[PDB]
Design a protein around this ligand. Structure first.
Ligand SMILES: [Zn+2]
Ligand SMILES: [Zn+2]
Ligand SMILES: [Zn+2]
Ligand SMILES: [Zn+2]
Ligand SMILES: [Zn+2]
Length: 75
């Protein structure tokens, strides 16, 4: 029979912990939550504008999410 792992992790890149995928971050929050906080702080904690700016992030490829994170989060 198969020795393959049962139900292997299939986590989306946006749902991985910041400090798992980015060696420059110490946060344990999912990438998408770190990006959300960046936009919230930019928008004085207006969730409506924040949701508009986050929408395109969900259509980004993983390489684009890394590029965005390094632009706005890596400080
Ligand atoms: Zn076998
Ligand atoms: Zn299962
Ligand atoms: Zn993971
Ligand atoms: Zn979350
Ligand atoms: Zn904040």
């Amino acid at each position: 029979g198969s020795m393959a792992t049962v139900d292997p992790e299939k986590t989306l890149f946006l749902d991985e912990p910041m400090n798992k995928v980015f060696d420059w971050s110490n946060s344990e929050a999912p990438v998408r939550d770190a990006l959300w906080d960046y936009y919230m702080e930019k928008n004085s904690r207006d969730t409506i504008k924040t949701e508009e700016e986050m929408k395109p992030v969900l259509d980004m490829s993983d390489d684009e999410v890394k590029a965005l994170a390094e632009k706005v989060l890596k400080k």
